[PDB]
Amino acid sequence: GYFKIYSKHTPIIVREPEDLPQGFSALEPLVDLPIGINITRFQTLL
């Protein structure tokens, strides 16, 4: 039921295309939403 979000902001210095950074960063939890809703599909918003 619970919906959790993990995130960490990192200042990348590497160029933008196809460069997922070769390193390690542990993502910290932000919130724990006590919803009771099933989730099967998702989409980003821009």
Binding site: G1, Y2, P34, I35, G36
Partner: protein
């Protein structure tokens, strides 16, 4: 006439007796669903020894 529409009204005047002087009633209906519990009673604490 012969169309008695269902809306009626009250006639509260400030010298009525009990049973006719108006009351304010609210009901707090509780329910337990499959969702996680979000509303709960207070949890008092003690000192730090």
């Amino acid at each position: 006439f012969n169309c008695y529409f269902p809306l009626r009204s009250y006639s509260f005047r400030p010298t009525y007796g009990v049973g006719h002087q108006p009351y304010r009633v609210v009901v707090l209906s509780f329910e337990l669903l499959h969702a996680p519990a979000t509303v709960c009673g207070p949890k008092k604490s003690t000192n730090l020894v």
